[PDB]
């Protein structure tokens, strides 16, 4: 798993 950006990942 990983992130594109941060909004979805950090919420």
């Amino acid at each position: 798993w990983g992130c594109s950006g941060k909004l979805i990942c950090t919420t």
Partner: antibody
Amino acid sequence: QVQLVQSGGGVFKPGGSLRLSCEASGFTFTEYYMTWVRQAPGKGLEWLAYISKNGEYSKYSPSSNGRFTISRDNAKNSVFLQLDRLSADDTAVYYCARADGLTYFSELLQYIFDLWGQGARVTVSS
Amino acid sequence: IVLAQSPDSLAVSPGERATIHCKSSQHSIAWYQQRPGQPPKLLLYWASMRLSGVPDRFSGSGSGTDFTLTINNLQAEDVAIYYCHQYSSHPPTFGHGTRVELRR
């Protein structure tokens, strides 16, 4: 300022092809998957494609059938959309949009479009 | 996976309350604002979380299958088309939108 500026719209004869450009600034480009979304006059929003951070992996709407190619140039902070075999149905406004979401390997998941270009108008007519 | 959005159009007086609904066939919901001749702008995601900069009068809610966008103290700059977005389905889908006009 965090923005995406597009260019490359215009009027086109059918049967040919076009490329649209989008230039990103104000944020770290390689941290985001980029996408294209189009909106036909009157209709709603249709997601077209996404491209991964390193510009190597791209996914398309089931209705694309290979006609669309999204690509990116990280050194130039730019994303592109090429569209072949143009027809009148391709007449629409095309948006460049930044995607914030999860990735699972190269697959983009749970994504929202948090930043949008100003759009490019495309008209296809004989 | 469809998104029935309603009502299609909605007349509201300034200062009053606008209420937009979004139902899916099956909380990954996002709301977008598009003013005439303008690109879409993200307002809410996870159904209820406003993006930074979006005024407090915009609020989202929704239990499971039905979702609501609420605009309180309606302003003139709020006249736009609003789109709900389901981002847990493949591919992602949008509603056909809801026009918010002024009431006279």
